Design a protein around this ligand. Structure first.
Ligand SMILES: COc1cc(Nc2c(C#N)cnc3cc(OCCCN4CCN(C)CC4)c(OC)cc23)c(Cl)cc1Cl
Length: 276
């Protein structure tokens, strides 16, 4: 695939859906010139409020995000350079998997939970096979394309911005220790974030390290503390998560191994998730 470079005139933002550190997200419309059609899209505006740099040039890394497509990632339809960067995707109205599980909780049933572990790993495996480091995997950035199928969103976006060493800006509770301590991001550090994400699913959207201050999270990890075993998880599921949070980057599983292992468990869900 190949992403489109939009003219500013064929994009219109219509409503803010959210706002974080990696930009503001809008419901939008794509109006391709002269075709008499208005296509619903989702628009993420990235503005560098720290250093006030522009995004007028189409970098190799923006083209890399735009040449990826897979059933379990959100395709980047295109972008629109400018003083702020606009990223354009399909609009997925069903929203985020985090909100879904928080609302329905155990009513979702064990098959769907394990199936989603498979799908997120397959999406991540695709991204790894194409050399794309996500840098911000989390249950909030897994989106429902359908009631049963999810897609990994926001891959590559953190790299669109240069680091600011000015003295909360990054998602500490989802990050591998090597990323916190050294700013190093790899497919192996995406595996750590994957383990947190599937922990979010099995707890139905509990907050990781619920009541501790962010400053204290690295020290607890080095001392060997980890997210607790979810109530529905048998020891076999939890052990897959624990291997994801090894400080040794080389002991963590691969995305191929993770998709394989959740495939095997999804073949007999109640032997692995026990939902009262
Ligand atoms: C464009 O670029 C990017 C966009 C995104 N984020 C989203 C992507 C994608 N992709 C796709 N689809 C999304 C749909 C959303 O809202 C749907 C449900 C909300 N409704 C609000 C109003 N009430 C009445 C009903 C529910 C949404 O909300 C925040 C974010 C979405 C990301 Cl994570 C990264 C990049 Cl680079």
């Amino acid at each position: 695939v190949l992403a489109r470079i939009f003219k500013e005139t064929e994009l219109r933002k219509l409503k803010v859906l959210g706002s974080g550190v990696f930009g503001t997200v809008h419901k939008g419309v794509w109006i391709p010139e002269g075709e008499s059609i208005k296509i619903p899209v989702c628009i993420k505006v990235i503005e560098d409020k720290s250093g006030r740099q522009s995004f007028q040039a189409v970098t190799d890394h923006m083209l890399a995000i735009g040449s990826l497509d897979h059933a379990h990632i959100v395709r980047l339809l295109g972008l629109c350079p400018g003083s702020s960067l606009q990223l354009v995707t399909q609009y997925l109205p069903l929203g985020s998997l985090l909100d879904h599980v928080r609302q329905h909780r155990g009513a979702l049933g064990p098959q769907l939970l394990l199936n989603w572990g498979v799908q997120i790993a397959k999406g991540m495996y695709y991204l790894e096979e194409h050399g794309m480091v996500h840098r911000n995997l989390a249950a909030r950035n897994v989106l429902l394309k359908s009631p049963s199928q999810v897609q990994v969103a926001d891959f590559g976006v953190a790299d669109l911005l240069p680091p600011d060493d000015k003295q909360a800006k990054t998602p500490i509770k989802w990050m591998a220790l090597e990323s916190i301590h050294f700013g190093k991001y790899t497919h192996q550090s995406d595996v750590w974030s994957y383990g947190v994400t599937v922990w979010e699913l099995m707890t139905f959207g509990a907050e990781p390290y619920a009541g501790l201050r962010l400053a204290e999270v690295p020290d607890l990890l080095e001392k060997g503390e980890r997210l607790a075993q979810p109530q529905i998880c048998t020891i076999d599921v939890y052990m897959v998560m624990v291997k994801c949070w090894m400080i040794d980057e080389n002991i963590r599983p691969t995305f191929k191994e993770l998709a394989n292992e959740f495939t095997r468990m999804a073949r007999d869900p109640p032997r692995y998730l026990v939902i009262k």
